[PDB]
Design a protein around this ligand. Structure first.
Ligand SMILES: Cc1cn([C@H]2C[C@H](OP(=O)(O)O)[C@@H](COP(=O)(O)O)O2)c(=O)[nH]c1=O
Length: 129
C-alpha cells in the first residue's frame, strides 16, 4: 500500500470528498466507514468534521487498498490522509462514523479502525452517547 498525492476540490459529506487525482477530478468514497446520511443523527456533524479536516490540510493523500479501486457509482475507494492523518480513522475515533462495508478485498486497515471504534464507544462519543 502506498499514499499518492491529490488535491481537494470540494467537500461532499462525511465519507465522500471530491478530489483531483492524477489530473482528473473524481469523487472518493472513504473505505471501511459509514457516516450518518445528511437527515440522520450526527450527519451534519460528520460532514463538518471531514470538510474541516480536509480543507485545513496542507497535503491530501489517497491510499488505495489491495482490491477494487472504484465502486459501482464510479467513486474511488481509498483511505484519505490529511497531513499524514487518516480521515477514515479520525471519523471513527470521534464517534462520527461506524466501521462498515468490508468489500472487494479492501480490509487492510479494518483492525486499526475497529480499535478506534471501540475507544469511541468506550468514551460514549457522539453516535455512541
Ligand atoms: C464503502 C463502500 C461502499 N460501497 C457501496 C455500497 C453501497 O451501495 P448501495 O447504494 O447498494 O447501498 C454504497 C454506500 O455508499 P454511501 O454510504 O455513500 O451511500 O456504496 C461499495 O460498493 N464499496 C465500498 O467499499
Amino acid at each position: 500500500l502506498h499514499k499518492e498525492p491529490a488535491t481537494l476540490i470540494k467537500a461532499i459529506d462525511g465519507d465522500t470528498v471530491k478530489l483531483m487525482y492524477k489530473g482528473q477530478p473524481m469523487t472518493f468514497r472513504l473505505l471501511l466507514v459509514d457516516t450518518p446520511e445528511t437527515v440522520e443523527k450526527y450527519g451534519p456533524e460528520a460532514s463538518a468534521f471531514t470538510k474541516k479536516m480536509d480543507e485545513n490540510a496542507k497535503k491530501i493523500e489517497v491510499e488505495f487498498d489491495k482490491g477494487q479501486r472504484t465502486d459501482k457509482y464510479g467513486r474511488g475507494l481509498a483511505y484519505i490522509y490529511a497531513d499524514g492523518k487518516m480521515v477514515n480513522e479520525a471519523l471513527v475515533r470521534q464517534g462520527l462514523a461506524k466501521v462498515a462495508y468490508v468489500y472487494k478485498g479492501n480490509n487492510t486497515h479494518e483492525q486499526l479502525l475497529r480499535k478506534a471504534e471501540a475507544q469511541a464507544k468506550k468514551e460514549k462519543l457522539n453516535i455512541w452517547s
